[PDB]
Design a protein around this ligand. Structure first.
Ligand SMILES: O=C(O)[C@H](O)[C@@H](O)[C@H](O)[C@H](O)COP(=O)(O)O
Ligand SMILES: O=C(O)[C@H](O)[C@@H](O)[C@H](O)[C@H](O)COP(=O)(O)O
Ligand SMILES: [Ca+2]
Ligand SMILES: [Ca+2]
Lengths: 541, 541
């Protein structure tokens, strides 16, 4: 009996036939109406296909929904992950409010704070040289072993905050079971000077098991002494009994909890590799930036609430325009893993076909998230954004000031960002193009033959999110805005954003195929479909 | 008057209601019918939503189209890029047939061969130490400066063929105008031991101008002598008069031609950075692998022609299912830039709204290409591939043998690849899930509450392309298959795959915004829409 977001009313808001050029021409308050600020982030949604009536309608849907209650439930530790019967408490990992919070018997404030202090102490001990390897040498390299939620957030943040690296440690990320991943690290690190991190909430993920066993074999090939594991491995898990079983003791184990989703885990002990690159102080700033956004989201009326507006725009488009993707365009090299990161956070959350009650939904839910760094994308897929015939909402991320003094480069980067959103909005008409071709020296026959191919239809929507700089704090705020957008969309679709029963299945598949690959007389091999069977046959011969 | 590909007939082939499980159960020739081989590439399209009637219908469309003629025209140098009045001759860059080919007065065989010999000589001179820097030191580092087509192919191939690196040179890629790109290279290279490559077909691209000027300033800050440019820069262009104007002489300029599209240019002198990593012999093998596929495509009847089948499947889905994206899943770390590369090749080619005649088309053309490396994607967006409600065709790329002896890792990587396609095909029904939950120890109430959330609908399509290994040759074959797929789709849609009037516009935009940013009294500033104006105001203050 939840409110239906994608209803007949939405399908018909589109009939307003918004013309963005006309709106900016006629409404001198357009930017004031359709932009928001949060500290030093400027959120400009004014190039979206909305006017007051459409935004009002969308906000009414949010107000009529369970969203207000669901926000409170999330922060209070209610078990909103209803299919796994878990709280959803990534927010608590970065809390600065210190309000009381007791969940399933645990003082969450105390638990979070104590574990941070343990990570901070480990980083300090390693960076200061108090932690030595088994042969007594100072550590110079950190290798994180993990996949998915135990890999991509730390990897993305370490890159994004490269200018802030300050520990004299090189941090490497091993993830894929493809041994190329492990080898890229092992080829450049020395067993006597490397600390290995086994990052795994479950401690039973195939890839991370195989990679950790292989890394341990490499370490022990060198030292020929099992006692060396103590100086060269730590673990991060919710499953401490399983860590001990691998050979790492509790004093070398760092906790996370069931209420930390992998794709929302960089804020937890899983982020230790981030601290090892940028120092713990900068890791605290990353968390504080997210807290600022958490407070904004929790406390702000929906009409002025950035994540809510992000979510309403996105779901409006995917409902009313039947779009099946969204483009995210970060105009900063440091954000080269940001699309990949959000692709996981978004699609793994909201790629769901049933509602909370288990009913198959008759409306589309999460769509594909993709994109690429600017300005490079302008040379590639922006062609399709300008002249294809696919409706695609676009977010640009711009950073006002960079980390260097090549001011001409930075000005050009921003000019291009703003030009691209402007060009999506205006396009270029046949008449404009034709007259420009004549002015360039083409005769009338030539200009008539070419002009239609240069028409850019325009009236295509975009949002621009402008940060003052890309610091630990502003990056943390930026990620948190999208975390909450994803949450709001899930609420409005009445799905569970926090389970992943397709990912869970993936972790159990192909034990059967491995068995088949190793014995063609097995039941497993006999029961194969023939496509799988002939693929296996081809990798044998 | 071209044949309409997306017609009523296609929309109705879907009514066959293909059930993949049922097809494999009942048809013991399914794999034989719906797979092809080209040398050591196996193309298995049998998990697609086709049967004989659907494939026949699609092949009839190809046979009825202009495709047969268009293939001949492409290879013969006809001006199939009709809006720029250019030939489309990336094929000629890798030719081994030596058949006569004269285009716009040039012997293309002689031109291509002579330029290869020049690149080969440069690489040999640099690697042998015959080429010295201005202070007499051997070169140790190569920096390619270029963007889009002058960046991404070389960058992707250099990574993909990392195991084959053999010149003792480190190759770096500078592209974005964001000065972070240039700085990542300059921070790790020495002016006295670095050769800089200015890669630009036009020699007038904003980003590459600014990056090249900045690199030259860095070089000259060190040497304080303009004569040093001679030992530290080469250029690749179709516009040799513009190179001279920058200060590089003709003997240091390497040619490409107007008939080499940027996004099809790695095969040309633009690929020099690839040769500088892997040696010229391996670069020749890359080209030979593409030639093998060119010969396949040119000579093979459509029913057995891999690129044609790829194109027909893709366009069938995007027509009949109204899908707006395709997923590409490379199960090898070395292919980490492959999706990005093909995203450019595909979307920039086929993101077009008008046909060859300039008429606005009433059918959808190119769709979004996205994806990610396996197995990592299984932990992230595969959730949406399994349980979302978006129809998305999927290609998997598998490599039978890797470059190391971690055979357990490689077997697991392949098992996972094949398991994922198998799981897309079969899914898991309510009954299967429910009975598994009971067997795990849940009672009936608990199993009923959870089961619907674990249902995986299945009957989702995939193709698997299996290579024997990822070598220069097999990579070249792989890229060429997709080049030709894109070509075939464009033909069937009656669009020009080879222009990019949205990218061309991008290169001219925001001169106006830069002018506005530098003078708020300008006409440019006054004429701004207010969203752009307030964004500029915010990056001032
Ligand atoms: O939260 C998520 O997005 C997923 O559950 C998944 O990506 C998970 O993080 C990995 O499978 C690693 O799991 P472990 O941390 O348990 O090894
Ligand atoms: O072919 C392409 O895909 C595009 O035309 C574009 O990506 C182009 O390669 C770049 O804009 C660099 O152009 P230059 O090589 O002329 O600098
Ligand atoms: Ca209400
Ligand atoms: Ca025919």
């Amino acid at each position: 009996n939840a409110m239906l977001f994608c209803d007949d009313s939405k399908k018909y808001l589109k009939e307003q036939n918004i013309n963005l050029k006309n709106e900016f021409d006629k409404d001198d308050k357009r930017v004031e109406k359709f932009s928001l600020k949060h500290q030093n982030i400027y959120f400009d949604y004014s190039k979206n296909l909305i006017n007051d009536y459409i935004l009002k309608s969308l906000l009414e849907s949010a107000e009529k929904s369970s969203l207000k209650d669901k926000i409170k439930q999330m922060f209070n530790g209610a078990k909103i992950n209803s299919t796994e019967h878990r709280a959803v408490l990534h927010t608590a990992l970065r809390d600065l409010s210190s309000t009381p919070l007791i969940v399933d018997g645990q003082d969450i404030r105390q638990e979070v704070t104590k574990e941070k202090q343990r990570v901070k102490e480990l980083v300090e001990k390693v960076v200061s040289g108090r932690w030595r390897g088994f042969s007594g040498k100072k550590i110079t390299d950190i290798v994180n072993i993990g996949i998915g939620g135990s890999d991509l957030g730390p990897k993305m943040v370490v890159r994004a905050l490269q200018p802030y690296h300050c520990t004299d440690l090189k941090v490497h990320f091993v993830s894929n079971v493809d041994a190329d991943s492990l080898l890229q690290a092992l080829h450049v690190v020395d067993p006597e000077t490397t600390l290995l991190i086994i990052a795994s909430k479950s401690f039973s993920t195939e890839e991370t098991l195989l990679n950790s066993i292989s890394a341990r074999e490499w370490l022990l090939d060198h030292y020929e002494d099992e006692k060396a594991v103590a100086n060269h491995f730590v673990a991060i898990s919710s499953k401490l009994d399983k860590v001990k079983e691998f050979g790492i003791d509790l004093e070398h184990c760092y906790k996370m909890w069931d209420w930390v989703g992998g794709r929302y885990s960089l804020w937890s002990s899983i982020g230790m590799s981030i601290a090892f690159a940028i120092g713990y102080d900068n890791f605290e700033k990353l968390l504080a930036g997210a807290y600022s956004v958490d407070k904004h989201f929790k406390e702000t009326e929906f009409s002025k609430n950035i994540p809510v507006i992000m979510a309403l725009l996105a779901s409006y488009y995917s409902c009313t325009y039947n779009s099946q993707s969204q483009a995210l365009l970060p105009y900063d090299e440091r954000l080269c893993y940001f699309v990949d990161y959000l692709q996981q956070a978004d699609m793994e959350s909201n790629g769901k076909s049933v509602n909370i009650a288990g009913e198959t939904v008759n409306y589309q839910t999460g769509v594909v998230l993709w994109g690429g760094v600017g300005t490079n994308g302008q040379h590639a897929f922006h062609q399709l954004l300008h002249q294809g015939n696919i409706f695609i909402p676009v977010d640009f991320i711009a950073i006002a000031t960079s980390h260097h003094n090549y001011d001409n480069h930075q000005q050009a980067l921003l000019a291009n960002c703003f030009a691209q959103s402007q060009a999506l909005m205006f396009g270029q008409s046949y008449d404009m193009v034709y007259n420009e071709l004549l002015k360039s020296g083409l005769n009338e026959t030539q200009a008539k033959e070419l002009a239609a191919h240069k028409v850019i239809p325009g009236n295509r929507p975009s949002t621009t999110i402008l940060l003052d700089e890309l610091s630990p704090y502003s990056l943390g705020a930026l990620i948190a805005l999208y975390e909450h957008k994803i949450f709001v969309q899930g609420v409005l679709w009445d799905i569970n954003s926090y389970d992943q029963w397709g990912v869970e299945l993936g972790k159990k598949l192909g034990k059967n195929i491995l068995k088949a690959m190793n014995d063609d007389s097995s039941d497993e091999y006999q029961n194969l479909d023939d496509s799988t069977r002939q693929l296996i046959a081809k990798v044998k011969n």
